[PDB]
Ligand binder design. Structure first.
Ligand code: FAD
Length: 270
């Protein structure tokens, strides 16, 4: 099979072939690989880099795909667009996300990778480099806790999809997914389809900054009780994965993980 990202030092221009509106500000962007028989070449859990020249600046941003090496001919990204003239303190908006939003079908952008400190090697085995300098440390776990906000769902879905497609993978994933309003719950159909098909290995819970009137899940920021009730208990010695805005990690996740009893050595932030 042909690998797209043959070298991590080479930038590969890929063409946009599809673009799906997921919410008011978030899209799934599908790019064609060099041939329909190509695969991306992305170990489970890692990310890529997009680069482009935008107004005299060389903009480089990382993005974690939701597709896998099982997907021939394409790669899927899920990107939130930081629109201009929308936020008072940031009137110019975000550079890369608005550039992607303006891309027409067929337009190209340079991909590079893979990159990242975590790789899922299957059957509960996670290879995590303690820092950018060291070799990966292997620890096998029976369950994984997952806290995501917004597009932080993308690395989690990469791991969830890899586990569920293997019938001999008995790892159990518990996902706590936090967003602002109900319309901001990205990839809800895909998540609930996986939960309804693999309910013994996949537990799923939402919280919202502002919930609707009829709401069966959580309301408010991630807190101590949500982690206690919807992540695996610390006695199982699970791995706890996190992806979201740095302030949500700093204020909502890390202190409340300490409160429940999940040690820092068993936690990882994408
Ligand atoms: C490892 C990793 C993985 C990532 N994976 C993903 C992914 O899968 N999907 C994804 O969408 N992003 C992902 N990101 C985030 C991504 O790399 C960028 O930070 C994001 O796309 C913003 O880049 P930008 O150039 O569009 O905005 P920038 O030009 O970098 O904007 C600067 C900052 O200003 C703020 N800002 C600007 N305009 C607004 C606005 N209108 N409202 C609110 N705040 C605003 C934001 O905080 C923004 O980051 C990932 C980041 C990392 C480090």
């Amino acid at each position: 099979p042909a690998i797209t990202l043959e070298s991590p030092d080479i930038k590969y221009p890929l063409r946009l072939i599809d673009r799906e509106i997921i919410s008011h500000d978030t899209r799934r962007f599908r790019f064609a690989l060099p041939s329909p028989q190509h695969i991306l070449g992305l170990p489970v859990g890692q990310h890529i880099y997009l680069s482009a020249r935008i107004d005299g600046n060389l903009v480089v941003r990382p993005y974690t795909p939701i597709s896998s090496d099982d997907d021939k001919g394409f790669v899927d990204l899920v990107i939130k667009v930081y629109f201009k003239d929308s936020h008072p303190k940031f009137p110019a908006g975000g550079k890369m996300s608005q550039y992607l939003e303006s891309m027409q079908i067929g337009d190209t952008i340079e991909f590079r990778g893979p990159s990242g400190l975590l790789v899922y090697q299957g059957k509960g085995k996670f290879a995590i480099r303690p820092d950018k300098k060291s070799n990966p440390i292997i620890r096998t776990v029976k369950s994984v806790g997952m806290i995501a906000g917004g597009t932080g769902i993308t690395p989690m879905l990469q791991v969830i999809r890899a586990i569920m497609k293997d019938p001999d993978d008995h790892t159990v994933c518990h996902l706590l997914f936090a967003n602002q309003t109900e319309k901001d719950i990205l990839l809800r159909p895909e998540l609930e389809e996986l939960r309804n098909k693999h309910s013994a290995r996949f537990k799923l819970w939402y919280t919202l900054d502002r919930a609707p009137e009829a709401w069966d899940y959580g309301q408010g920021f991630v807190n101590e009780e949500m982690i206690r009730d919807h992540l695996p208990p610390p006695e199982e010695e699970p791995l706890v994965l996190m992806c979201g805005p740095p302030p949500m990690i700093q204020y909502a996740c890390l202190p409340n993980l300490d409160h429940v009893g999940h040690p820092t050595e068993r936690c990882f932030v994408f």
